[PDB]
Design a protein around this motif. Structure first.
Motif, PDB file in Angstrom:
ATOM      1  N   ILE A 231     -41.745 -15.278  54.439  1.00 34.56           N
ATOM      2  CA  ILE A 231     -42.990 -14.873  53.799  1.00 34.56           C
ATOM      3  C   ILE A 231     -44.031 -14.505  54.843  1.00 34.56           C
ATOM      4  CG2 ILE A 231     -44.958 -15.857  52.591  1.00 34.56           C
ATOM      5  CD1 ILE A 231     -42.909 -17.116  50.675  1.00 34.56           C
ATOM      6  N   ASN A 232     -44.105 -15.269  55.930  1.00 34.10           N
ATOM      7  CA  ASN A 232     -45.069 -14.917  56.960  1.00 34.10           C
ATOM      8  C   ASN A 232     -44.679 -13.647  57.697  1.00 34.10           C
ATOM      9  OD1 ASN A 232     -46.090 -17.388  56.122  1.00 34.10           O
ATOM     10  ND2 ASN A 232     -46.766 -17.924  58.177  1.00 34.10           N
ATOM     11  N   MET A 233     -43.404 -13.260  57.653  1.00 31.20           N
ATOM     12  CA  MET A 233     -43.010 -11.945  58.140  1.00 31.20           C
ATOM     13  C   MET A 233     -43.415 -10.848  57.169  1.00 31.20           C
ATOM     14  SD  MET A 233     -39.265 -12.782  59.710  1.00 31.20           S
ATOM     15  CE  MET A 233     -38.740 -11.141  60.166  1.00 31.20           C
ATOM     16  N   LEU A 234     -43.298 -11.103  55.867  1.00 28.07           N
ATOM     17  CA  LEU A 234     -43.721 -10.121  54.876  1.00 28.07           C
ATOM     18  C   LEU A 234     -45.222  -9.874  54.919  1.00 28.07           C
ATOM     19  CD1 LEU A 234     -41.455 -10.893  51.828  1.00 28.07           C
ATOM     20  CD2 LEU A 234     -41.169  -9.298  53.678  1.00 28.07           C
ATOM     21  N   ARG A 235     -46.009 -10.904  55.213  1.00 27.55           N
ATOM     22  CA  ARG A 235     -47.450 -10.722  55.328  1.00 27.55           C
ATOM     23  C   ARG A 235     -47.823  -9.778  56.463  1.00 27.55           C
ATOM     24  NH1 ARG A 235     -48.966 -15.881  55.256  1.00 27.55           N
ATOM     25  NH2 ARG A 235     -48.491 -15.698  53.026  1.00 27.55           N
ATOM     26  N   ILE A 236     -47.036  -9.751  57.536  1.00 31.41           N
ATOM     27  CA  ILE A 236     -47.325  -8.844  58.641  1.00 31.41           C
ATOM     28  C   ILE A 236     -47.150  -7.398  58.210  1.00 31.41           C
ATOM     29  CG2 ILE A 236     -46.460  -8.055  60.858  1.00 31.41           C
ATOM     30  CD1 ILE A 236     -45.909 -10.973  61.503  1.00 31.41           C
ATOM     31  N   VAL A 237     -46.065  -7.102  57.506  1.00 33.00           N
ATOM     32  CA  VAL A 237     -45.726  -5.742  57.138  1.00 33.00           C
ATOM     33  C   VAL A 237     -46.231  -5.401  55.741  1.00 33.00           C
ATOM     34  CG1 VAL A 237     -43.823  -5.407  58.688  1.00 33.00           C
ATOM     35  CG2 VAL A 237     -43.465  -6.601  56.578  1.00 33.00           C
ATOM     36  N   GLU A 238     -47.152  -6.197  55.208  1.00 34.89           N
ATOM     37  CA  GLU A 238     -47.678  -5.951  53.868  1.00 34.89           C
ATOM     38  C   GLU A 238     -48.175  -4.530  53.614  1.00 34.89           C
ATOM     39  OE1 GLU A 238     -51.420  -7.961  52.579  1.00 34.89           O
ATOM     40  OE2 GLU A 238     -50.061  -8.742  51.040  1.00 34.89           O
ATOM     41  N   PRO A 239     -48.940  -3.876  54.495  1.00 36.74           N
ATOM     42  CA  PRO A 239     -49.334  -2.490  54.200  1.00 36.74           C
ATOM     43  C   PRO A 239     -48.173  -1.523  54.107  1.00 36.74           C
ATOM     44  CG  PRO A 239     -49.906  -3.074  56.429  1.00 36.74           C
ATOM     45  CD  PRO A 239     -49.592  -4.342  55.729  1.00 36.74           C
ATOM     46  N   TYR A 240     -47.011  -1.859  54.658  1.00 39.51           N
ATOM     47  CA  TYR A 240     -45.897  -0.931  54.745  1.00 39.51           C
ATOM     48  C   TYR A 240     -44.822  -1.154  53.699  1.00 39.51           C
ATOM     49  CZ  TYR A 240     -47.370   1.295  58.994  1.00 39.51           C
ATOM     50  OH  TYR A 240     -48.060   2.034  59.917  1.00 39.51           O
ATOM     51  N   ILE A 241     -44.899  -2.220  52.912  1.00 38.74           N
ATOM     52  CA  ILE A 241     -43.842  -2.554  51.972  1.00 38.74           C
ATOM     53  C   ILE A 241     -44.433  -2.830  50.603  1.00 38.74           C
ATOM     54  CG2 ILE A 241     -42.377  -3.512  53.771  1.00 38.74           C
ATOM     55  CD1 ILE A 241     -43.191  -6.247  52.900  1.00 38.74           C
ATOM     56  N   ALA A 242     -43.609  -2.627  49.587  1.00 40.34           N
ATOM     57  CA  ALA A 242     -43.842  -3.125  48.244  1.00 40.34           C
ATOM     58  C   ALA A 242     -42.694  -4.058  47.912  1.00 40.34           C
ATOM     59  CB  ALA A 242     -43.918  -1.990  47.228  1.00 40.34           C
ATOM     60  N   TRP A 243     -43.007  -5.290  47.544  1.00 44.29           N
ATOM     61  CA  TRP A 243     -41.950  -6.251  47.314  1.00 44.29           C
ATOM     62  C   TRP A 243     -42.267  -7.099  46.101  1.00 44.29           C
ATOM     63  CZ3 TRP A 243     -42.476 -11.655  48.067  1.00 44.29           C
ATOM     64  CH2 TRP A 243     -43.682 -12.059  48.628  1.00 44.29           C
ATOM     65  N   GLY A 244     -41.245  -7.790  45.628  1.00 46.20           N
ATOM     66  CA  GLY A 244     -41.404  -8.643  44.474  1.00 46.20           C
ATOM     67  C   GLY A 244     -40.177  -9.455  44.160  1.00 46.20           C
ATOM     68  N   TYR A 245     -40.070  -9.924  42.923  1.00 50.38           N
ATOM     69  CA  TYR A 245     -39.009 -10.841  42.515  1.00 50.38           C
ATOM     70  C   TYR A 245     -38.050 -10.125  41.585  1.00 50.38           C
ATOM     71  CZ  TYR A 245     -43.077 -13.600  43.757  1.00 50.38           C
ATOM     72  OH  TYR A 245     -44.199 -14.096  44.371  1.00 50.38           O
ATOM     73  N   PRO A 246     -36.910  -9.662  42.081  1.00 49.48           N
ATOM     74  CA  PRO A 246     -35.971  -8.948  41.221  1.00 49.48           C
ATOM     75  C   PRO A 246     -35.366  -9.868  40.186  1.00 49.48           C
ATOM     76  CG  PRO A 246     -34.947  -9.424  43.289  1.00 49.48           C
ATOM     77  CD  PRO A 246     -36.373  -9.845  43.435  1.00 49.48           C
ATOM     78  N   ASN A 247     -35.051  -9.297  39.036  1.00 54.00           N
ATOM     79  CA  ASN A 247     -34.369 -10.034  37.993  1.00 54.00           C
ATOM     80  C   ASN A 247     -32.888  -9.682  38.015  1.00 54.00           C
ATOM     81  OD1 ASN A 247     -34.505  -7.465  36.927  1.00 54.00           O
ATOM     82  ND2 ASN A 247     -35.475  -8.061  35.015  1.00 54.00           N
TER      83      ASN A 247
END
Ligand SMILES: [Mg+2]
Ligand SMILES: [Mg+2]
Ligand SMILES: [Mg+2]
Ligand SMILES: [Mg+2]
Ligand SMILES: [Mg+2]
Ligand SMILES: [Mg+2]
Ligand SMILES: [Mg+2]
Ligand SMILES: [Mg+2]
Ligand SMILES: [Mg+2]
Lengths: 63, 125, 128, 53, 225, 109, 240
Positions: free
Chosen positions: E107-123
């Motif tokens: 999660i702390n890696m995702l926060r770094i690249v937040e402007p560059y990614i769209a992410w979420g919780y797949p079903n």
RNA sequence: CCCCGCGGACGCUACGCCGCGACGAGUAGGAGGGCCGCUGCGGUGAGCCUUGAAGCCUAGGGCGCGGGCCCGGGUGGAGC
RNA sequence: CCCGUCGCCGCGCUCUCCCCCCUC
């Protein structure tokens, strides 16, 4: 585009002898077949050594 | 040895024609006339060649004998087949297959004999 | 009427026009033979839109139909009858053509022999 | 094959075997090296050359 | 001896056929069992929420353990830290997607690249469609389409994963061999979103596309593949 | 005895502001001014019929000066009833503002 | 040998049967149908005949080739689909039912309104806007190139002759069998002739189609007229 | 223990042929390949040529991503 | 031996016997 670097794509290594010696090329054919069709790693080492240059094949003394 | 002599003549030969992105080889006993180890008509202990007959009818099947490899005067035995096409093809097939005499050239020799006989039959109007 | 090749695929040419040299239109001293522009400010080299296109490997022909004549054959240059017989076993893929400096009387014999061997000649009526 | 050393017949001036044989000299079983022969030929044809300037 | 060798070959081929039938039956029953497990999880969440509401309390579901991450920006003018994290997430191209096991470190890696990614919780449907339509394996360093269960079984059979159902299960429920199964999956090469993006340069909660959209990543996935 | 083809106008090529993809064309069909009305014409054959100087062979007739470039409607374009069309050869630019015929031939009704 | 049975597994969706493996096992009674364990003459002998000519000859059929081309073409791979056209399935539009009035869109009968009879084995429609109304005989047409109108007549209980098939309607031609160089003209026989058999069948079909057409008012005049696009009307707005 | 059939495509210039996967911006600069091109020498093509060489011209036919090349017609007149 | 309608996958029928409904 992809974000990769291409400066290490081509591996620099002998894939064949630079020599035009036909006897060397004949036994390169022989050991190429042996390396491909056997599981022995000795054959692979011998083939890659046959590719090598003279400074990479230093003489071995009797002693 | 065939492989040794091939390493000598594979690119340096007076029978070599390299032209138009194509390569041909014109030594006497070459079926398909291609520059190749298998079809080279000089470097092997046993070769077979099919040529048109001396007159305008039949084929000559020439095979290399085993003994006199270094004696080119007597090294080749030539026979003339001047029969109908089916019997000629059967004769060549039996020379190559029954003798086990270089069986990788059987269809090449049969096709070359067919080409020669077809060229010998008269041209149409 | 003509001898037909073994197979007759559809030949796809990626580009049909020649690559003319940059500014070969504006000068006679500059022939249309392609030369790569190497100027520091050259817009053809920099590939600005609307400019002369540069030959690169992406224009290459399909290897199955490369060097293939519109007839479906591939040409082989012959200077005499002996060179003609090398195509005896390649009748249906390669067509002979007689060299430009072969005399009329000799090319008559080459044409006759090719007709006998069912070899297609691209210039069979060329000195007569 | 290298150890093999046949007998080569000596032919008369009429082109027929005279019944004499010579064992093949061992030099005819030496290695055949077109690259070495080409190198030596290339570097030895330069030696009859005549200067130009 | 011709009859003997013929019988020997027939016995060998029959044994091969029996083994293949046993493996097919195993795959079938594993898939049926996974269907049972999926519906049990789906119903259990609803039942827990229902009993909490009946008591007058709140049922807080477990924080999601799996994320789907899509790189939404291109490769031009990227800062070095963002570039490194994207390479570690295996998103080296725009509209490349991958699964990420969620924990503090990821999660702390995702926060770094937040402007560059769209992410979420797949079903479950998102996982199914991503694996089935665009699932490729990294087999012998090559991108090989998952056209046969043998491709999965050769590479991940030693982990018990021998079919697309096993792979989907190991991704959806993170499990013990998520690292191996996920790294076996070549990163998904999705298409451009059909219908467009709102604004790729701003965060999702301010009307854009970047950052964490919790369960709207499934709406994004339906259009991107 | 009657027209049997809808009138369309060759409006231009599929384009950006400063790029032009000549391989596909935009057509304004008469009476079709909404995107929801273009469903009837999808896949319909369309022809650009013109006259030239030399005679050319006419199927089922004697040679005349009429030539034709065939094509078909591929999809709708925009919200205002324009359609896209792919012709066998890219339409000449002299045809812009001229008549295309939409022939109803591969009907689905 | 036993007589064949029906499928015993109804198709609820293509590729999926109604019953499962075990259900089909029980329906087939595979529990008691269990099994554990248990040409063409190439050469003909012929009496050749003749004194001291040998008894017979073993003549082989299917002799070997006399000539081989210089090169050949490798055989194709196997494709598991791609049936021939005679085995293709034939789909007919729902709006096209027997008795429906159709508008021909191509050919010399362009614009004419005809009556649909049946779909033939090749999927072509058999139509006859009766020959006395619009000069359209018993003819084939392609459903892609017709417009199915909403007006229909009940042609149930009329008998289309069984011999009206694609083989019946296929075109006939015969040129250059013995003729090689074209300098003497072969342009004769270009006049197709209406066979008296075709006239008989046309009268047979029309004699039971026309009474039903005259039943409803001004349908015959509608069939006599042709379809056209007026400058104000648009086919996407038209209800046919 | 193949035999009423005596039979069964192509291939493998191994410096060859085939398969699969990813990739393709580029000045200065580096490297590889060139059946790209020029002139001369050693070999070789039982090469070409006064029944027409070189060169040149050409709304002629083509090939190659390209460098370029081949062929037709004309002119030319001795070599390529 | 006249052109491998072939592999994996999903099915149907027969080597069991009765019936039922249209049709010859
Ligand atoms: Mg680069
Ligand atoms: Mg070109
Ligand atoms: Mg110029
Ligand atoms: Mg600059
Ligand atoms: Mg930017
Ligand atoms: Mg859209
Ligand atoms: Mg910015
Ligand atoms: Mg790229
Ligand atoms: Mg580059």
């Amino acid at each position: 585009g992809v974000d990769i670097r291409h400066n290490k794509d081509r591996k620099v290594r002998r894939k064949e002898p630079k020599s035009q010696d036909i006897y060397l090329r004949l036994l390169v054919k022989l050991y190429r077949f042996l390396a491909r069709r056997t599981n022995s790693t000795f054959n692979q080492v011998v083939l890659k050594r046959l590719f090598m240059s003279r400074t990479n094949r230093p003489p071995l003394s009797l002693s | 040895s065939a492989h040794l002599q091939w390493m000598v003549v594979r690119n340096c030969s007076s029978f070599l024609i390299k032209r138009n992105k194509q390569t041909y080889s014109t030594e006497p006993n070459n079926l398909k006339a291609r520059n190749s180890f298998r079809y080279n008509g000089l470097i092997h202990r046993k070769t077979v060649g099919v040529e048109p007959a001396a007159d305008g009818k039949g084929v000559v099947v020439v095979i290399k004998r085993r003994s006199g490899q270094r004696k080119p005067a007597t090294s080749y035995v030539r026979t003339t087949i001047n029969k109908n096409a089916r019997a000629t093809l059967s004769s060549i097939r039996h020379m190559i297959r029954k003798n086990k005499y270089r069986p990788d050239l059987r269809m090449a020799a049969i096709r070359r004999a067919s080409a020669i006989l077809r060229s010998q039959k008269p041209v149409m109007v | 009427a003509a001898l037909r090749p073994l197979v007759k695929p559809k030949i796809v040419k990626k580009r049909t026009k020649k690559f003319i040299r940059h500014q070969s239109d504006r000068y006679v001293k500059i022939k249309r033979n392609w030369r790569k522009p190497r100027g520091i400010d050259n817009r053809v080299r920099r590939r600005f839109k609307g400019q002369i296109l540069m030959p690169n490997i992406g224009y290459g022909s399909n290897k199955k139909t490369k060097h293939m004549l519109p007839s479906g054959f591939r040409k082989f240059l012959v200077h005499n009858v002996k060179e003609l017989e090398v195509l005896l076993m390649c009748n249906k893929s390669y067509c002979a053509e007689i060299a430009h400096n072969v005399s009329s009387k000799n090319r008559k014999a080459i044409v006759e022999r090719a007709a006998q061997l069912a070899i297609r000649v691209t210039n069979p009526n060329a000195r007569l | 094959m290298a150890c093999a050393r046949p007998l080569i017949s000596v032919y008369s001036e009429k082109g027929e075997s005279s019944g004499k044989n010579v064992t093949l000299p061992a030099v005819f079983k030496a290695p055949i090296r077109p690259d070495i022969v080409n190198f030596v030929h290339t570097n030895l044809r330069k030696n009859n050359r005549q200067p130009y300037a | 001896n011709f009859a003997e060798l013929k019988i020997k070959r027939l016995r060998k081929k029959f044994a091969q056929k029996m083994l293949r039938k046993a493996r097919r039956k195993l795959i079938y029953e594993k898939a049926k069992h996974y269907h049972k497990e999926y519906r049990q999880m789906y119903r259990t969440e609803i039942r827990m929420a229902r009993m909490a509401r009946k008591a007058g309390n709140f049922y807080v579901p477990a924080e999601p353990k799996l994320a789907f991450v899509i790189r939404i920006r291109g490769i031009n003018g990227v800062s070095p830290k963002v570039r490194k994290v994207l390479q570690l997430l295996r998103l080296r191209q725009i509209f490349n997607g991958t699964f990420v096991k969620l924990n503090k470190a990821s999660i702390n890696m995702l926060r770094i690249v937040e402007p560059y990614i769209a992410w979420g919780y797949p079903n479950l449907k998102s996982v199914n469609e991503l694996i089935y339509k665009r699932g490729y394996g990294k087999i012998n360093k090559k991108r090989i389409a998952l056209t046969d269960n043998a491709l999965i079984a050769r590479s991940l059979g030693k982990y018990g994963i021998i079919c697309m159902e096993d792979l989907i299960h190991e991704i959806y429920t993170v499990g013990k061999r998520f690292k191996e199964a996920n790294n076996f999956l070549w990163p998904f090469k999705l298409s451009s979103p059909r219908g467009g993006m709102k604004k790729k340069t701003t965060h999702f909660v301010e009307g854009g596309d970047a950052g964490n959209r919790e369960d709207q990543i499934n709406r994004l996935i339906r259009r991107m593949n | 005895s009657g027209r049997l083809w809808s009138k369309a106008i060759f409006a231009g090529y599929k384009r950006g502001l400063r790029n032009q993809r000549e391989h596909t064309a935009l057509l304004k069909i008469e009476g079709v001014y909404a995107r929801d009305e273009t469903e009837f014409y999808l896949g319909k054959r369309c022809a650009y019929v013109y006259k030239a100087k030399n005679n050319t062979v006419t199927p089922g007739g004697k040679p005349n000066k009429t030539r034709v470039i065939w094509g078909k409607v591929t999809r709708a374009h925009g919200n205002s009833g324009m359609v896209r069309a792919k012709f066998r050869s890219n339409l000449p630019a002299k045809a812009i503002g001229h008549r295309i015929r939409v022939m109803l031939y591969p009907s689905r009704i | 040998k036993g007589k064949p049975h029906c499928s015993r597994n109804p198709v609820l969706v293509r590729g999926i049967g109604r019953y499962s493996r075990s259900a089909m096992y029980s329906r087939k009674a595979m529990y008691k149908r269990k099994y554990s364990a248990a040409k063409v003459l190439a050469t003909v002998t012929k009496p050749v005949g003749g004194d001291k000519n040998g008894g017979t000859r073993v003549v082989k059929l299917r002799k070997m080739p006399r000539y081989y081309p210089t090169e050949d073409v490798p055989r194709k791979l196997l494709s598991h689909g791609k049936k021939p056209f005679s085995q293709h399935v034939r789909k007919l539009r729902a709006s096209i039912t027997p008795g429906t009035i159709l508008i021909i869109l191509t050919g010399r009968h362009r614009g004419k309104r005809v009556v649909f009879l049946k779909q033939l084995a090749s999927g072509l429609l058999l139509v006859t806007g009766p020959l006395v109304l619009n000069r359209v005989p018993l003819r084939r047409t392609h459903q892609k190139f017709v417009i199915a109108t909403s007006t229909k007549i009940d042609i149930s209980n009329v008998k289309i002759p069984k011999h009206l098939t694609d083989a019946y309607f296929k075109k006939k031609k015969l040129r250059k069998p013995r003729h090689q160089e074209g300098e003497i003209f072969d342009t004769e026989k270009e006049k197709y002739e209406i066979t008296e058999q075709r006239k008989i069948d046309q009268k047979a079909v029309d004699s039971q189609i026309l009474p039903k057409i005259k039943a409803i008012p001004q349908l015959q005049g509608y069939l006599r007229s042709v379809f056209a696009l007026t400058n104000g009307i648009y086919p996407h707005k038209l209800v046919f």
